[PDB]
């Protein structure tokens, strides 16, 4: 019995440290701690797969239980990135097949997934694979799906949301129906499936007692009544298709929705069918009227009925009027997204504009807001001040102002941005997309100066000259990822700002004063710094994408993508 050290107890304690940022530190106190973290780390996420070799990952964390890889830049979600850009997942699955023999959950995000590489996954990991998330991926088919549902007999969560694949049949769903029991969450929310049987979906609901969430394609809701009755423990449902014919005015008034259902969004839902929600609106906590066919007035009447709503996603049709309703009925609101609707034939009505009015109304009512993303048709410095004044635990704030409107009340937002950034000091992600006059170099530097916590920024049309970008660059202590498009800065100005930024590890840019030389970008050449130049897919000016990588320049570039390498 000698005095007991930490070293006598650390292997045990380490497994109680859950925070990814504390494991980070802990791995760095010494060689022993590093090894212990290495052999106990359960989940890792790579924000950019090209950042390291799959070898390096398996060597560092041999006993991962969960992995998550992201590929294509965020811009890809906007048909800005070429389809062939890369993000291929195969090297990663041959590595999983061979060295991550403990893996029970895989999440691919914005990646290329082939039938082969998922057949490989399925066989390699089989019964052990509890969860698989094909999140916004492409390049596979139903054969792939069929392969993972037959070999991975114990899948608890299976997801394809917004993924695109080739649909050759429906046997994958049916194979789930006939043999799966463990299913807890099933998700093909933004997907064109035309060959799967609602019957199978119902027979799955019957057999999976722990089925909590399911999101789905353009199924006719009526075809799902069998389903809903059977899905007792269902808490979330999004998707489906409400199709009204005139021949039935009460087509949908006899809907059994599962009793616990509290997170939902019915697609195409009009004002006529909207009422089927009233019977239990008190209970609804998440609402997805993103793909709903109801107008500004109809919004107010529904929102007004859901006092316990904490998440709401809708189009700008919600209107200022809608935002005002939200303002005093839903005080517990934590996340709000207002995507932009049909900006073609008028708005979607004459109240389908959000403005200073709505924002400042919202800022006063829903003070518990943590996430706010909004496409606005008009702002005022005042509104941003009220934001930064009332809602303190805002972590994620994104604002984009539409070019629809010709004159914007008061434009240079320098002083509004500032009070906002100063009031919400919990802010980690921040996006600000304007029109040209939107922000002066003075304001831009205000952003650098007052965003100590922000790791990610998406910047719109900020600044007036490179003076602004430089002023900006002397700030942003913790900026890691920077995305800017539609800016007036020059190559050497960018390259310079990159050098000044301490924390930056990922840079994407579209639109900048170029030079045939190309050589001005070069003045940011560091070791481990990869820079790439891009076109565009689904007039599109050059993209710059640069990131740190321990791996070197990728092998798998398309023809459309150029890798800069000192003097050519």
């Amino acid at each position: 019995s000698c005095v007991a050290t930490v070293d006598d107890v650390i292997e045990q304690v380490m497994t109680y440290i859950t925070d990814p940022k504390d494991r980070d530190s802990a791995s760095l106190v010494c060689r022993r701690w590093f090894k212990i973290d290495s052999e106990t780390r359960e989940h890792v996420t790579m924000a950019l797969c090209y950042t390291a070799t799959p070898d390096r990952l398996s060597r560092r964390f041999p006993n991962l239980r969960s992995l998550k890889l992201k590929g294509k830049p965020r811009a890809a979600m906007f048909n800005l990135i070429p389809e062939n850009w890369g993000g291929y997942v195969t090297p990663w699955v041959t590595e999983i097949s061979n060295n991550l023999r403990q893996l029970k959950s895989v999440h691919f995000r914005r990646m290329i997934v082939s039938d082969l590489d998922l057949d490989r996954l399925a066989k390699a990991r089989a019964d052990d694979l509890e969860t698989l998330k094909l999140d916004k991926c492409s390049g596979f088919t139903t054969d792939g799906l069929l392969s993972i549902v037959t070999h991975c007999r114990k899948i608890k969560t299976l997801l394809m949301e917004e993924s695109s694949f080739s649909e050759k049949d429906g046997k994958w769903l049916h194979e789930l129906a006939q043999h799966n029991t463990s299913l807890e969450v099933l998700n093909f929310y933004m997907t064109e499936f035309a060959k799967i049987s609602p019957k199978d979906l119902e027979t799955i609901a019957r057999n999976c007692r722990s089925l909590v969430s399911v999101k789905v394609g353009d199924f006719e809701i009526l075809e799902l009544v069998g389903f809903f009755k059977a899905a007792a423990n269902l808490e979330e449902f999004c998707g489906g298709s409400l199709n009204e014919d005139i021949g039935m005015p009460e087509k949908y008034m006899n809907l059994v929705f599962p009793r616990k259902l509290c997170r939902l969004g019915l697609s195409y839902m009009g004002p006529n069918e909207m009422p089927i929600l009233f019977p239990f609106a008190a209970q609804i906590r998440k609402l997805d009227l993103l793909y709903a066919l109801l107008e500004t007035e109809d919004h107010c009447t529904l929102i007004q009925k859901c006092p316990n709503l904490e998440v709401l996603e809708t189009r700008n049709v919600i209107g200022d009027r809608g935002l005002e309703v939200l303002a005093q009925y839903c005080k517990q609101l934590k996340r709000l997204r207002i995507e932009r609707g049909a900006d073609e034939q008028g708005m979607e009505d004459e109240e389908g504009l959000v403005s200073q009015r709505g924002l400042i109304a919202l800022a006063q009512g829903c003070q518990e807001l943590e996430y706010m993303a909004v496409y606005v048709s008009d702002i005022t410095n005042e509104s941003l001040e009220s934001i930064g004044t009332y809602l303190k635990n805002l972590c994620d704030f994104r604002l984009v102002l539409l070019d629809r409107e010709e004159r914007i009340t008061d434009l240079p937002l320098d002083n509004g941005v500032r009070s906002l950034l100063i009031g919400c000091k919990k802010l980690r992600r921040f996006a600000f997309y304007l029109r040209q006059g939107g922000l002066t170099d003075l304001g831009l530097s205000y952003i650098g100066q007052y965003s100590p916590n922000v790791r990610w920024m998406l910047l719109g049309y900020v600044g007036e000259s490179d003076e602004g970008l430089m002023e900006f660059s002397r700030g942003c202590p913790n900026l890691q990822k920077l995305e800017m498009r539609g800016c007036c800065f020059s190559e050497r100005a960018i390259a310079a700002a990159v050098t000044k930024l301490p924390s930056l590890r990922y840079l994407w840019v579209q639109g900048y004063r170029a030079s045939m030389t190309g050589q001005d970008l070069m003045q940011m050449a560091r070791p481990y710094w990869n820079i790439e130049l891009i076109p565009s897919r689904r007039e599109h000016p050059a993209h710059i994408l640069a990131y740190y990588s321990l791996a070197g320049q990728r092998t798998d570039c398309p023809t459309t993508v150029r890798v800069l390498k000192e003097p050519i």
């Binding site: 811009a75 979600m77 906007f78 048909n79 800005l80 917004e162 933004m190 993103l290 793909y291 066919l293 189009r315 995507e339 932009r340 609707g341 049909a342 984009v400 539409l402 070019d403 498009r485 539609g486 579209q510 639109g511 689904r538 007039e539 000016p541």
Partner: peptide, 18 residues
């Protein structure tokens, strides 16, 4: 002339809408 790029999930929907 940089146009506001539409988030793809909504682009798909706005067409189905019409």
């Amino acid at each position: 002339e940089l146009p506001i790029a539409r988030r793809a999930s909504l682009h798909r929907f706005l067409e189905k809408r019409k």
